[PDB]
Amino acid sequence: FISTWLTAAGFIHLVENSGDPWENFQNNQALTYWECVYLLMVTMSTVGY
Amino acid sequence: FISTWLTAAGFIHLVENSGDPWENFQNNQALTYWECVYLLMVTMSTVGYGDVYAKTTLGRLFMVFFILGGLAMFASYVPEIIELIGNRKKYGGSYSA
Amino acid sequence: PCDSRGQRMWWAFLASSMVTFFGGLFIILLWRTLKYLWTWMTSVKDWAGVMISAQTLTGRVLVVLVFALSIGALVIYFIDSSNPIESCQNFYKDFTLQIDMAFNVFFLLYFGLRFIAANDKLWFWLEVNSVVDFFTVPPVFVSVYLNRSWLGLRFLRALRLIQFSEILQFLNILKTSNSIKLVNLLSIFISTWLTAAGFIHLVENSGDPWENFQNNQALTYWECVYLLMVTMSTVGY
Amino acid sequence: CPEVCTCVPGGLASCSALSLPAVPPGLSLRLRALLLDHNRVRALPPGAFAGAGALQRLDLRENGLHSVHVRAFWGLGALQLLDLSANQLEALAPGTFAPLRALRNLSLAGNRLARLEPAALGALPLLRSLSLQDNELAALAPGLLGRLPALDALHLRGNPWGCGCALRPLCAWLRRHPLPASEAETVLCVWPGRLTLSPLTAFSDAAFSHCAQPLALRDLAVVYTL
């Protein structure tokens, strides 16, 4: 559980802080790793704030 | 259930009404205790409206750790309490001569 | 000439409903206490009981009328919910109110007949159908008397949908266990969904009583139905 | 008294047409009857006129005011003339006019007030007249008119009203005495339906309509027992 949570949070962090390649890395979102951990925890429990 | 609900709501109220210690208490969010009770009730049921939510690091951390377990508590308690209330025998009367 | 609404009064309808409920409850309790240590009726009771169930052709006619008129009352509630919560409407112009008059007169007569047929009057008083009869008909009579309309506890009409399973069982339409269970579940679910949506609509289109009604949120009844459906399924957009 | 505005012979007073986004400084008791025209005073701080012991006329013409403090007029004490017209105020702060007990004259012309609070206005028992010309307000609470005992004349030119219950007090006030001084001063009442149109001068005073009686006991007895 911990490994899946942390790895998913890290992947979200890497994807969001960097952008989308077809967009010239312009569509980015400055998300902290802690914020990504929180987002994965909210998503995985079907809360979805 | 009631005691833990009220305690979690009180902790969220305390954390949100007084900001993070490392932010010099400038990150505070004015929340009435009733609003925090509503927030905890919404979170426990996995609804997540998003109209009201925690914003101050400690609040989010407590929300994460509460999601890890209070949700299971709610899911395993509320149907059980509902079942323990409806246990009644319908034909309990006496014939009227 | 199609004027607007001004002064807001709503305690008349609610007060009339609360009187009709609590006064009858207190009279029943007082009669019971007086009977306690002295501190042809069967014939008419049996006739009313036969009338309530579809035992006679007139009984089946009454049951089918109850079904159809409960559906019609729910539809009329929808139409009135499309209107503003508090309005002034003269009796003789709008054709909706005469239809509501006939529906409520029929429901009042049906309630009286059911009370005549009831075994225990006190437990009959505390019935969901009896309660929704208490909080719906006196408000309609007060509204037609005062020539002004308030969207009060009219969502309770949806609670009349619970008795559909018993209505069908009387008419010898439902016989199997699976069909009976399906009808029960569907009727209960629809009734509670619509009642919750109506209560939310009433509480949201008006404000908090202590806030001078300044917290009003413009929510259509369909929007409240959508909100309740989203909430019940733990989606929460 | 103000350095920018030349001192007026006799009693000191402010200058007209002053160009000054800054409030006139050096206010004192000798300074009376301030006149401000086409200035840019964004807000009035609390106790703004405390330096001036007593004032007679205050005229805020063509000045952009978007926020007035509740205690901005603590200093006035016994002000007589004050016109609040052609201003940018969105709403009056509660208790703003409470110190203005001696305010004889006040006019509200062209103020974009959505609704003015009767508590903010205060009693103002010594009010000669008022105006409601070209104001954005469309509904007047009965308490607003009922609070002022000695109000005499109210100007409603250029501000058509919406027919309904909100009109019932005002026309009743019109029933007490005629507001239109001349036939050219008459205004018409707007209706929600475009088919119907009516002038307020042709509108009957205290005319019967729906909800004529806000409360009664004869019907109260029957609605409690029907």
Add this chain to the structure above:
Amino acid sequence: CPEVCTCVPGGLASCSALSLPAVPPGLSLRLRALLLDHNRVRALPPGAFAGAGALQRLDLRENGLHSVHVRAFWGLGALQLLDLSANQLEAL
């Protein structure tokens, strides 16, 4: 004839550059060819032209109106000219 503006003998014409955000009071049917210049009002007040029964033209000079009301134009009807120049209208 407007109160502040000069009364022109014969054919009445409004004074240019009135610098009044609100419409002049005392409008009459004899008054014609109103000229509203430098109106600071964001919106046209309803029934503003109701004082004057009939006109022939209407000109706005450096007037910015973000919105107008239907009752504002009721008092007109006999006009053959209407100018809203450099206005800030967005919706009608």
